[PDB]
Write a protein that binds this DNA or RNA. Structure first.
Lengths: 123, 80, 105, 78
RNA sequence: UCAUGGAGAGUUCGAUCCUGGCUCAGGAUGAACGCUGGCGGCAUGCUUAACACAUGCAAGUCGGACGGGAAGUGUUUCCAGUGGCGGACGGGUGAGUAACGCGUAAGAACCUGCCCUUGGGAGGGGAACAACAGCUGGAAACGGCUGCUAAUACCCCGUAGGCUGAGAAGCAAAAGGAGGAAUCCGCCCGAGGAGGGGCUCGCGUCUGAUUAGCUAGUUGGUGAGGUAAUAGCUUACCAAGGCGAUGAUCAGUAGCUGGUCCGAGAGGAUGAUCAGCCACACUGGGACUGAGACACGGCCCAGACUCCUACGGGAGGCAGCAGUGGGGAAUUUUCCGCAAUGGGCGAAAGCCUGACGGAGCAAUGCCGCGUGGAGGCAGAAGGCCCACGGGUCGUGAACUUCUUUUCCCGGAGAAGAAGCAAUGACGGUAUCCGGGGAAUAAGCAUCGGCUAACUCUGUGCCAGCAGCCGCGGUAAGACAGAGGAUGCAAGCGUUAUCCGGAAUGAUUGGGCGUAAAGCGUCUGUAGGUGGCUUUUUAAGUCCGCCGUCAAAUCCCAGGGCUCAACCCUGGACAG
């Protein structure tokens, strides 16, 4: 790439920081409607039953979001609040569900790091 | 014309005023050909820059009320 | 009526001045129309030229009458009256420019 | 300001000449000196310019949409 | 002297070097959510649906222009109407607009009420139109005949350093009011200036060639018109031009800039509040008056939509401030005041300003402050862990004294307001003085490596965690709990967006034998670069001077708020 004419045509441009969440497309976290609350398995090295809610969003997408924590109240057609963040083990799950927010209760009996799970103080 | 007038330049409850000779149609905090004067009503000085006020009053930009009152404190008024 | 009108008062006065200015600009178009009309006739078939200019000059004076009168009232700026009086005397200078008054710079 | 000297392109219009104006310009991000051509319509009531002569453009009153210059002559100090 | 700036780590492999990608450590948000929440100062507060809008208010004023009437009994306050300016400013939003719209820098063909300077003028007449009185139509909204009236309201004649025209010639104006006067505010015609606009042009102004031709008032010329002014602005005829592979045309996106944030730097992204310019005002399209609009709260028409109707018809534009509803993860009070400041009007008095000045709510942000200070036998009670010796929570607490920022209970009490006095929404706020009293006040992440912090109990590829690597199949420094520790602190975390790191788009700063990559080779157009000497102009280049790049911001130095944040004054390199 000489300074003359292969480069005052253009070098090229890198695209963007590609969006790591194609939904949520305004901004960070977005209200959701539960459609399925099924349970899938990770890839080969792990072994678990991870419990994800496939959730329709208010944006216009439908997307399978993970449910953190131990206990979960989430039945059919409830309302959640999804956020970004890639669960590695599950192919397709791109998102999380916030706990302690609207119609998704905090986890049962947790006393270490409660702000990630929406549990008020005991004691 | 131009109307020599103050503009509020300070925080809340402060009232540090500039004397600017802007066109009268502008909003009260706009832009000037030459920002001539100062007025600090709490307690401080008032730089005036007499030759430029005589330039604009010599041209005929009438001032407002209290700008004229500041101009009546000092002996600025000469009709030449 | 209401205690404050303030803009319908405007629109009333705008209706009135619409009537007056519409009307008397139309008077100006009529008198310029007659001047250019008779000039067209004496360009067409007159056969004696330096004599009948008194009528064209008379109606042209009425044209300069209503032109400048409507220059006094605010419906015509300067360089409107200048452009149209200059228009009429362009036309007169052309009708004499074809023929018997010889004019050269 | 400056005039804009430049070659006459094609004068198949009365009182009207197209003029290439060649202008060096620093390209912004990369620091060379790229030429850009821009051709204009100039006025001449004399229309005494053939193809290929080179004139100087000076701003005047706009004559048409594009014709906003009249070109007379360069100085010629070699 | 200048320098005030550049950090790495993990992951390919049994290991090693390397290329290369991902991920993190750093800042910033107009932010959102979770947990927790003492105060103060200053900012900020629909990013989304330019999506509809209930209610009130957001633009008036002038009786010293004029006529009437309606309270008060010579005297004054008001008033619908005709007039005068103001409604084109101020406020709000960014849908459009890739374009002289903006930014910067020149130019000539113009206009300009209010504002200064300046030369001259204001004789004479006359007709009505509102108002009003009567009749009458309508639920309302509005009207309709009949008469009448005044003026700074209209019309005519004369007169004019103006205009038209080559000249000849013609053409054109006025208004009075206040006051006893004095005089002042005016009016008409000119001539300048300032400021404000209207135009034109150089340069800068996003991506896409899987959009290659476009353009026929199109690009010129003349004549006729037109505009405040130049102009295909418009029209008839003639010429065939004009733009484009340096991206025309089309499609898509986007208000722009002082600036903000990042970066060592070059520059990358972006345009909230602050400020300047543009555009829009329910969606479209028109014109009217005025100096100035094609006018947010003007008019007329069409379209869609909501309200009223007595069914014939009317009325309406919150993207003004507050507010409601919807959408959204998410953005407030249907507040006080014209005291200041700035507008508009008026001779003044004053009036009106949801601009603006304040107040309220919200840790939304930046800054400051507190939750105690000093001592505390090294003796006890307890949690957790222990080679059962003990260790550690731990001077921590308990406990003794000191103090009161804050808290409560009382007193005082501002400037802000302008030399005639009076004039404060804020507010009895800020600040100060006195009386108790440690009293009223600490959480949230993390502890496998990056990355500071670790052991124990339970679970047994389950529950789960996770930013990347990956932990989890019986003793887990990675899950869950406890203890302890770490880092932060009225905050702490997660997420999203942007830059850094990233030399991972490279001018500074990369590569092409084998890692991704040299066309199969060759001719050659456009274009790019180019031998030596001498001479000339100076376009580039360099130096001086000058103009400008608004103010605010950033940098330096002072100054003010008890400091800081923030505010203010002056100065300037760059470029």
């Amino acid at each position: 790439m000489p300074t003359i004419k292969q480069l005052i045509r253009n070098t090229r441009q890198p695209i963007r920081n590609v969006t790591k969440s194609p939904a949520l497309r305004g901004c960070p976290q977005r209200r959701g409607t539960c459609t399925r609350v099924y349970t899938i398995t990770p890839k080969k090295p792990n072994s678990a039953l991870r419990k994800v809610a496939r959730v329709r969003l208010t944006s216009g997408f439908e997307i399978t979001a993970y449910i953190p924590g131990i206990g979960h109240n989430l039945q059919e057609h409830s309302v959640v609040l999804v956020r970004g963040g890639r669960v590695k083990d599950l192919p397709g799950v791109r998102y999380h569900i916030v706990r302690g927010t609207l119609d998704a209760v905090g986890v049962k009996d947790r006393q270490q790091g409660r702000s990630k799970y929406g549990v008020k103080k005991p004691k | 014309m131009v109307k020599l007038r103050l503009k509020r330049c300070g925080r809340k409850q402060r009232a540090v005023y500039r004397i600017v000779a802007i066109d009268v149609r502008s909003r009260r905090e706009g832009r000037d050909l030459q920002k001539v004067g100062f007025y600090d009503p709490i307690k401080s000085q008032t730089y005036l820059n007499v030759p430029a006020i005589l330039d604009f009053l010599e041209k005929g930009a009438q001032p407002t009320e209290t700008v004229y009152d500041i101009l009546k404190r000092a002996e600025v008024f000469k009709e030449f | 009526a209401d205690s404050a009108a303030k803009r319908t008062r405007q629109a009333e006065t705008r209706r009135l001045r619409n009537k007056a200015r519409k009307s008397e600009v139309k008077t100006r178009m009529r008198k310029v129309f007659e001047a250019l009309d008779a000039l067209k006739k004496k360009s067409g078939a007159s056969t004696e030229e330096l004599v009948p200019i008194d009528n064209l000059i008379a109606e042209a004076y009425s044209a300069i009458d209503k032109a400048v009168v409507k220059g006094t009232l605010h419906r015509n700026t300067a360089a409107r009256r200048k452009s149209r009086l200059a228009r009429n005397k362009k036309v007169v200078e052309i009708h004499h420019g074809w023929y018997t008054p010889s004019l050269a710079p | 300001m400056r005039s804009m000297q430049g070659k006459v392109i094609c004068a198949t219009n009365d009182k009207t000449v197209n003029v290439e104006v060649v202008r060096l310009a620093p390209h912004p991000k990369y620091k060379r000196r790229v030429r850009k051509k821009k051709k204009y319509q100039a006025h001449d009531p004399d229309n005494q310019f053939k193809v290929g002569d080179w004139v100087q453009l000076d701003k005047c009153r706009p004559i048409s949409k594009t014709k906003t210059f009249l070109a007379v002559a360069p100085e010629g100090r070699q």
